[PDB]
Structures are given as C-alpha cells and as structure tokens.
Write a protein that binds this ligand. Structure first.
Ligand code: HEM
Ligand code: HEM
Ligand code: HEM
Ligand code: HEM
Ligand SMILES: O=N[O-]
Ligand SMILES: O=N[O-]
Ligand SMILES: O=N[O-]
Ligand SMILES: O=N[O-]
Lengths: 141, 146, 141, 146
C-alpha cells in the first residue's frame, strides 16, 4: 500500500530523471547482467555487451512500463496486466529476479540523483518497485 | 569468495575513498528506514520515528561505524570470510536470531549508499565486484545457520 | 490472482479440515518453532513447549484468520486490514517469516489430508497462503 | 550441517521407508506444478500442460529418481555435503544458472511429499530434522555461487 508521501516522492524522482529514464533503464539492465549473471539466461538472443542496441532498446521499454505504472499508480494491476501475463506465462520469470532488477534500478537512480535519493525517497522507490514486482508476479499459473 | 584481480582492483580502489565515520551509519539508517522490521533489533536506540530521526540518531551513526569496520575487515580477508565472521555469526545467528535475508538486505543498502556517494564512478563492473563482496559477507555471517 | 479452480480447491480443503482447523493451526505453529527457531523470538512471552495452552489458543486465532480470508477471498485486503496493520506496524514481522509459516501450514495439511492434498490442491493452497502473506506484508511503514 | 543423534535418528528411520522409485518424481512434479517458472529448465520433458500431465509424465518420474538419489547421497554424508554436491553445484550453478532459491523450494516440496506420505509419523521434530537436511543440501548445491 503506497502512501500519499510515497506517491509524491516517486513522482519527484521521476521528474528529476526526466528524459534520461530510457538510458537509466538500459544502465540498470547492464548492472543486473554483470552483478547477477543468472539473469542473463532470460535474454539468450540478446547481445549483452556494453553499448548493445538491444539492451538500449529494452531499457527504454522497461523505463516506459515503470512510467506507465507511476502515471496509473492507483490502478497498477490493471495498467500492468498485459505485462504480468507476459512475464509469468510466457517468460516464466522466476520471482527472485524481480528483486534483482529492482535493486539495480535503485542503484542506477542512486548513481544519478545525488540530491533526490534521500533515505525517505529511497524508501518510497523501494516500495514502488516492490509494488510493481508484486503485480508482475501475480499471475503464475 | 573469489574475486578476480580486476574485481579486487575495483573494490579496493573505491574503498580507500570511503568515509569510514559516515558510510556505515548511512547504510544502517537506510536499512532501518527502508526495511522497518529491522527496527525490531534496535529498540534501545531511541527515536526512530521518522527518516530524519533515524539518520540523525547518534546511536545509529555510532553503531554503523562498527558495522562498516566489519565490512572493512572482510575486504582485507576475502579468501577467509568464514574465519573473519565466526564470532559475528555466533552473535547474529545464535544470540540475536536475525534472519539472514537481512544480511543480504544490509549489503544491498550499502551498495546503494556507495552508488549515491560515488555516482558515475560506481560503474556497472564496480557494482558487480561489490555484489560478490556483500554476498560473501552475508554468507559468512549466516554460517551459524548452515 | 486466485483462479476459480484455486478458490474451489481451497474451499474443498477447508471443508475436509473442518473442525480440526484450530488444532491444525496449533500444529503448524509448533512445526514452525522447531523447524525455524528464529521465528520463536516473536513470541518471547509464550511458553512454546509441546501442549502449551498459549500455542493452542494462538493456533485457533491463526486458523480463524485464514478461514475469514477464505470466506472473503475476493476482498482479502479489506478482510485482513486490521491484521496487516498489526503484523507490520506493531509486531514488525519480517516478511521472510510469512513464507516459513505458510510452508508449515502446508506441511500440516499434507500430514492430515491424504486424499485432499493432490498436486493441484497443493498448488492452490500455496497460492492462497502467498496471497494472504502479500496482504499481511502490504503495510510497512 | 550438524544433526544431533536424535535428529539423525529421526531422519534415517524415516528415509528407510521411502519408496525411492516414486518420491523423487512426486517432489519434482509438485515443484513443476506449484512453482511453474521451474518448467523453464524442463522444456524437453514434453507435456507439462496440466498437473495430471506433469505427474504422469514418464520423464518427470525418471528424472525425479536421479534427484532423490542425490538427496539419498547427502543423507549418507551429512558432515560433507559440500564435497558430495561439488559436481552438481558446478552443473546447477555454472552451466544451468538455476537461482538457488529454487533449491530451497525443491527441499520444501520434498518435505511436503514426506508429510503427505507419512502423515502423523512425520511429526514436528521429524520435520525439523528434515529442514536441517534440505537446507544443508540447498546450501551445498549453491556453493558455486558463494
Ligand atoms: C520492474 C520489473 C520489470 C518491468 C517493468 C519489465 C518490463 C518489460 C517490458 C515493458 C517488456 C516488453 C513488453 C513487450 O514488448 O511486450 C519486457 C519483456 C521481457 N522481460 Fe521484463 N520487466 C520487468 C522484469 C523482468 C525480469 C526480472 C526479467 C528476467 C530477469 C524480465 C525478462 C524479460 C524478458 C526475457 C522479456 C522479453 C524480451 C525480448 O525478447 O525482447 N523482465 N519486460
Ligand atoms: C550486513 C551484515 C552485518 C554486519 C557486517 C554486522 C556487523 C555488526 C557488528 C560489527 C556488530 C558489533 C558487535 C560487537 O559489539 O562486538 C553488530 C552488532 C549487532 N547487530 Fe549486526 N551486522 C550485520 C547485520 C545485521 C542485521 C541485518 C541486523 C538486524 C536487522 C543486525 C543486528 C545487530 C544487533 C541488534 C547488534 C547489537 C548486538 C549487541 O550489542 O548485543 N545485524 N553487528
Ligand atoms: C498466514 C499468516 C498469519 C496469520 C493468518 C496470522 C494471524 C494472526 C492473528 C489472528 C493474530 C491475533 C490477532 C489479534 O488477536 O489481534 C496474530 C498475532 C500475532 N502474530 Fe500472526 N499471523 C500470521 C503470520 C505471522 C508470522 C509469520 C509471525 C512471526 C513469525 C506472526 C507473529 C505474531 C505475533 C508475535 C502475534 C502477537 C501474539 C500475542 O502476543 O499473543 N504472525 N497473528
Ligand atoms: C533440491 C536440489 C536439487 C538436487 C538434489 C538436484 C539433483 C539433480 C541431479 C542428481 C541431476 C542429474 C545430473 C546428471 O544427470 O548427472 C540434476 C539435473 C538437472 N537439474 Fe537438478 N537438482 C536440484 C535442484 C534443481 C532445480 C530447483 C532445478 C530447476 C528449477 C534443477 C534443474 C536441473 C536440470 C535442468 C537438470 C538436467 C541437467 C542436464 O542433463 O543437462 N535442479 N539435478
Ligand atoms: O528487463 N526486464 O524486462
Ligand atoms: O548492522 N547492525 O549490526
Ligand atoms: O502465528 N502467527 O501469528
Ligand atoms: O530437480 N531437478 O534436478
């Protein structure tokens, strides 16, 4: 359950990130693949090397999904329903991997938001990504 | 845990720049704010009612200092984390009964603090190397449960 | 997201358990305390020895909460809201501990439902307890 | 992992009654049905479309047999699980990249199968002893990640 304070914090961090969100998504994916190499097996057909166009394009898709979630924060199950289906049924994404990507998304924000990433905002972002993760694992099947 | 020389290089070069009086308290404060169940083990610390109360709590800073001292310790003994962490494992597992999932959490919070403080310098490979480290520490601290 | 099949399976298992639910809750708590001794620190004031009246009475409370959840399966966040508040805010229950109790509840059902505990019903019960757990950790704070 | 003689007694007495041609396949089938992401590593097994399809799948039973063989192995070597599981760890971690959380899950599913088959005989202390065992196996199988 995301609080009014949490929603304002996540909105503030989104704003500061601005037009870098795609690039940051790409960075978070690289951080994940290097830090948690088990995650790589989900992208056997991607080239995962640094500067990969496929990782860049995917980063944008992920960032776009998260922003759809922020923009529909009070109706996330509905907004992310198609993605929930995809990740559970087709991709069979192991639930642990959502915590790994969530951590890498936080790390990327921390590396780029010296002023914004306070203890309170870090908390709110953690809750937001945990809420997104809960939605995206809601389907198994 | 086995770090490659590149991983060792990434880890030690960064750590030499860490403010060892501050970073431990920052990681501990964030642990208490983000994962507030952990406040269960720190009732004696006093005011933990807000983020500001936690981060400015002098007991949080003082205790975080000791925690970072232990990370510093593991960094000097990567190939013998088990030995380094034996008495802390006895403490955290046999006496305190902290679930070891929280060791992983504190390690990840530390990583977040390092990223916040170092910015672009905390590159994806630098993070990777630190992930191996904090996993190694968590696993050694959890040895009494294994 | 609990399916129509899941809801019927959980209802069937509830029915078979019948008036033993309190006793089974007590057994699940004993299994937890012995198997996962870290959990004991949440009950410093209980006597946790075998046949403890406090563990028996608590078992009944837990079983009763789960049955309230079954009976209001489509409105669990609301039905369990007071309990969610209690477990996150006052008790500060570590989220990992919900998986431990959930596992011990399944084990207890498996030990008492030779016919009912099929692979499908085991699945549905797992999803049910995971849904309950998700509600009861929704609050931190 | 250190089991007490009472824990060892509980574990070995039960295991001697386990149908080693069946219990492994039952635990594997349940793993695939309950935690269906795990079907990712078993695409070649064929029809996994329903619970019935999984539990009656001959490849599931045959492979489960090998899995239980490995648990049987750890049970004979409790004080050296690391050595016993070295080549399986290499396989599950270095080659297959299975997240080690799933090792804990398979262990817990095994526990559920044991409870289902043994009923009242699978007492709370008997379970406790088995929990130490399956945690020990999961930890050894995960050694290549540590
Ligand atoms: C914060 C959590 C996540 C978000 C917001 C997210 C978002 C997305 C989006 C937007 C797509 C493309 C949708 C489409 O084009 O149909 C996608 C696909 C995919 N996702 Fe995720 N995802 C998340 C977590 C994960 C995790 C943890 C994994 C595995 C480690 C994963 C693996 C994949 C894979 C393998 C694809 C297909 C990629 C391709 O073939 O091009 N996702 N995700
Ligand atoms: C990341 C791994 C951790 C490290 C390296 C670490 C390190 C330390 C150190 C160096 C001490 C001082 C021991 C002494 O005074 O001799 C300590 C004490 C303590 N730790 Fe941790 N710790 C970790 C994780 C945790 C977590 C996650 C919790 C609870 C959520 C926790 C709870 C405590 C408590 C309550 C004490 C006070 C013990 C006492 O004085 O009786 N620790 N820890
Ligand atoms: C399936 C999940 C759970 C259910 C349905 C449940 C249910 C309940 C209920 C009905 C109460 C009493 C409510 C009241 O009288 O106000 C309670 C209290 C409590 N619960 Fe839980 N709970 C669950 C998980 C947990 C877990 C995982 C823990 C910790 C390991 C825990 C620890 C406690 C404690 C310490 C109390 C206070 C007991 C006392 O002082 O008498 N609960 N729970
Ligand atoms: C509970 C711990 C586990 C044990 C004791 C175990 C045991 C085994 C054994 C004995 C084999 C046969 C190796 C050989 O043929 O030489 C095997 C293979 C395999 N395991 Fe596991 N396993 C465990 C967990 C898991 C999990 C959780 C997964 C996936 C969710 C998995 C995936 C596989 C796969 C895909 C193979 C086939 C490997 C190949 O032939 O290339 N294992 N395992
Ligand atoms: O990168 N997650 O789709
Ligand atoms: O981080 N507490 O020792
Ligand atoms: O026993 N859980 O309250
Ligand atoms: O349990 N699969 O090896």
């Amino acid at each position: 359950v995301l609080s009014p304070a949490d929603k304002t914090n996540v909105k503030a961090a989104w704003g500061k990130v601005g037009a870098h969100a795609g690039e940051y998504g790409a960075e978070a994916l690289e951080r994940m693949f290097l830090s948690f190499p088990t995650t790589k097996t989900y992208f056997p057909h991607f080239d995962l090397s640094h500067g990969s166009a496929q990782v860049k394009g995917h980063g944008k898709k992920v960032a776009d999904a998260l922003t759809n979630a922020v923009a529909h924060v009070d109706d996330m199950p509905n907004a992310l329903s198609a993605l929930s289906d995809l990740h559970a049924h087709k991709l069979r994404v192991d639930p642990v991997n959502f915590k790994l990507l969530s951590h890498c998304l936080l790390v990327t924000l921390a590396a780029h938001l010296p002023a914004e990433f306070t203890p309170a905002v870090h908390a709110s972002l953690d809750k937001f990504l945990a809420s997104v993760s809960t939605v995206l694992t809601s389907k198994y099947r | 845990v086995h770090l490659t020389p590149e991983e060792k290089s990434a880890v030690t070069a960064l750590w030499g720049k860490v403010n060892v009086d501050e970073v431990g308290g920052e990681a501990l404060g964030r642990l208490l704010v983000v994962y507030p169940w952990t406040q269960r083990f720190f009732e004696s610390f006093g005011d933990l009612s807000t983020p500001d109360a936690v981060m400015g709590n002098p007991k949080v800073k003082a205790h975080g200092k000791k925690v970072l001292g232990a990370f510093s310790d593991g960094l000097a003994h990567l190939d013998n984390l088990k030995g380094t962490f034996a008495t802390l494992s006895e403490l955290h597992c046999d006496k305190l009964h902290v679930d070891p999932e929280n060791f992983r959490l504190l390690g990840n919070v530390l990583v977040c603090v390092l990223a916040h403080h170092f910015g672009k310098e905390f590159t994806p490979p630098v993070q990777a190397a630190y992930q191996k480290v904090v996993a190694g520490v968590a696993n050694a601290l959890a040895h009494k449960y294994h």
